[PDB]
Design a protein around this ligand. Structure first.
Ligand SMILES: NS(=O)(=O)c1ccc(-c2nc3ccccc3c(=O)[nH]2)cc1
Ligand SMILES: [Zn+2]
Length: 208
């Protein structure tokens, strides 16, 4: 049921998605080990992901959450990187897209920093890097990330350095407590609480 619509680089919507991608790059504490060394990306393509069933699944859950939280879905646009990106855009997020070993338990993880999600494009810890060159810092191979609509509802705040949400909550927020430059990361425990809105195809760029 999924259709991918190419956005033109001239479209304001392409431009605002690219800007969120580029402007949320940060340095990582692994010095690039997982995701590679780069300060910015070469954006190759941005596509809108269109699936009626998946959208209605999302909006249905969004209303349930909203009604449990004074009519406030607390909806964000967040990045997601995964070896399962192609399955996600066709079948939606589910229990198989969960990070079992994540620090906030077995859930589906999202980041404000695009560079954080980039660490997972090739698997946990960057796996063994790109399939062609086995390089976690490959500047040649095409990578994909999702920029997703995520319903957080009432989010449990964790101050830090599939399972269930904490009772009385719809998600968990991992607030950075050491690295002053890190943005928040978020976890949901229901696949229906995220919709993979944009598929972004890119390369990381070697710093000069
Ligand atoms: N199914 S799996 O290959 O085990 C898997 C998929 C996605 C991720 C992932 N973990 C994150 C953790 C913090 C912030 C953002 C992310 C992210 O974008 N993806 C982890 C594992
Ligand atoms: Zn490569």
């Amino acid at each position: 049921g999924t259709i991918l619509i190419d956005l033109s680089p001239d479209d304001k919507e392409f431009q605002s998605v690219e800007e969120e991608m580029q402007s949320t790059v940060r340095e990582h504490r692994d010095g690039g080990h997982a995701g590679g060394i780069f300060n910015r990306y070469n954006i190759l393509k941005i596509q809108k992901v269109c699936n009626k069933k998946l959208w209605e699944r999302y909006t249905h859950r969004r209303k349930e959450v909203s009604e449990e939280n004074h009519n406030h879905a607390n909806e964000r646009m967040l990045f997601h990187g995964s070896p399962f990106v192609n399955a996600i855009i066709h079948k939606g997020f589910d229990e198989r897209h969960a990070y079992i070993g994540g620090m906030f338990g077995a859930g589906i993880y999202f980041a404000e920093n695009s560079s954080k999600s980039n660490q997972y494009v090739y698997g946990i810890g960057g796996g063994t890097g790109c399939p062609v060159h086995k390089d976690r810092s490959c500047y040649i191979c095409h990578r994909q990330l999702l920029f997703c609509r995520v319903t957080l509802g009432k989010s449990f705040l964790q101050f830090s350095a599939m399972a269930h949400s904490p009772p009385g909550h719809h998600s968990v927020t991992g607030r950075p407590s050491v690295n002053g430059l890190a943005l928040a990361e978020y976890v949901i425990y229901r696949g229906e609480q995220a919709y993979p809105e944009y598929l972004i195809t890119y390369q990381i760029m070697r710093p000069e």
